[PDB]
Structures are given as structure tokens and as C-alpha cells.
Design a protein around this nucleic acid. Structure first.
Ligand SMILES: [Zn+2]
Ligand SMILES: [Zn+2]
Ligand SMILES: [Zn+2]
Ligand SMILES: [Zn+2]
Ligand SMILES: [Zn+2]
Ligand SMILES: [Zn+2]
Lengths: 63, 63, 62
DNA sequence: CGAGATTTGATACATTGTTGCTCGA
DNA sequence: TCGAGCAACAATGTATCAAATCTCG
């Protein structure tokens, strides 16, 4: 068995957790930028640049 | 129920209809701004915003 | 059984309404709401695009 | 009318982003 | 140990197909 079932970060950060399925637009803390939320947002830009790099190198191997 | 195979759009405007896989970054016309490709650039934001609206409608269905 | 539209412009306001010739009967015939505005823009892009192709093909002939 | 060309809603294919969670410094 | 960094869910984008309407002899 391999279940994951993700939960939203910003909702969990200010109080009650809630899993994301359609939640990306409905979030009540979609912006905010409180100093706690503000830090996790930088992590997302970092991870995105990181994962994008690995996917480029993954393409490089076939050539 | 029908076969599919992508080919790059921007490449077709100039001749070399190269099939699309990882080609989006290796493109010899990765940007370019001729009126042929200028329209295609407009075409992509319109279709993307349009399909995104339909993806929202699926959330309205809540199913 | 086959699956088929189901008009887009009607769905935007929720009333669904399948298309069979519904073009003119659409109840939102000629509309400029931000939702229905995109499809009108889509053909204007296509029309300007096809017009460009037919013109350049014509210019070389001289 | 029908045959071929042009719309137009629809979907398969590919890219990019987000969070759970491991593993080795 | 316990974080940095990887990969599984999930969004966003890209191009083509097929129903359908249109153009026209
Ligand atoms: Zn949330
Ligand atoms: Zn916050
Ligand atoms: Zn290309
Ligand atoms: Zn170009
Ligand atoms: Zn309608
Ligand atoms: Zn409308």
C-alpha cells in the first residue's frame, strides 16, 4: 500500500489543517504574508528552482 | 480513442516541425517575436486561461 | 454511448444547455463578460493568423 | 443539398509547482 | 540525530482531435 494524501501548508500554519484537492483557490490565507507564513513562501520558490534543475538533468541523460 | 503526437508550434511557423518532448527549452526559436509567432504567443495565453476556466468548472461540480 | 457538448457559453452561467444549432438561440448571443470574452478573442487570433498566411502567400506571387 | 474548408468545444500530452518524508553528512 | 534534498500528489500550460457549422458548385 502506498497512500500519501497531502494537506495544505498555509491552512495548517495559522490553525486547523485541511487537505488540498480544490483548495488552491479557496484558501483563506492565500496571501497574508505573516512572518511565519512569509518564511514558508520562500521555501516554495527554492524547491521549485531545485526540482526544475533535476528535471533538466534528467533530460540530459538520453543525449 | 485516436492516436496523438505533439509537434512544436513555434517551430512549424518557420519550417522545421520538430516533435515536442523536451524541446521547449532547446528550441532554436525559444523566444522570437515575428508577427507569425507573436500571434501564437497570444494564442497560448488565451487557450491556457480558457482551459483553466474549465478546470474551475470541474470544481463547481464538486464530483 | 457517445459523449458530446453541451454548449460552453451557457455553462458559464450554469444553465448547461446542449448545442444542436444553439448558436443564435444561446441567450448570450454576442457577449462581452470576462468569461465569454475569451472565446471571441480566440477566433480573432485565428482569423488574424489565417489572414496573415493567405496574405504572405499572395505577396510572393508578384 | 453534400464535399471540402473553417469554427469550436473538448482532451491527450507535456511542464511546472507543492508537500510528505527519507537518508546520509 | 535531524536537517537538506528527493519524489510522489497536483496544479498549469501546449498542441491537436472531432463534432459541427459554414462556404459554395
Ligand atoms: Zn489552504
Ligand atoms: Zn500567514
Ligand atoms: Zn520548438
Ligand atoms: Zn518566429
Ligand atoms: Zn449556449
Ligand atoms: Zn456571459
Amino acid at each position: 500500500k502506498s497512500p500519501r494524501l497531502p494537506k495544505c501548508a498555509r491552512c495548517r500554519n495559522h490553525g486547523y489543517a485541511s487537505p488540498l484537492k480544490g483548495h488552491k483557490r479557496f484558501c483563506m490565507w492565500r496571501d497574508c504574508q505573516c512572518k511565519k507564513c512569509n518564511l514558508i513562501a520562500e521555501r516554495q520558490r527554492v524547491m521549485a528552482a531545485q526540482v526544475a534543475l533535476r528535471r533538466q538533468q534528467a533530460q540530459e541523460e538520453e543525449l
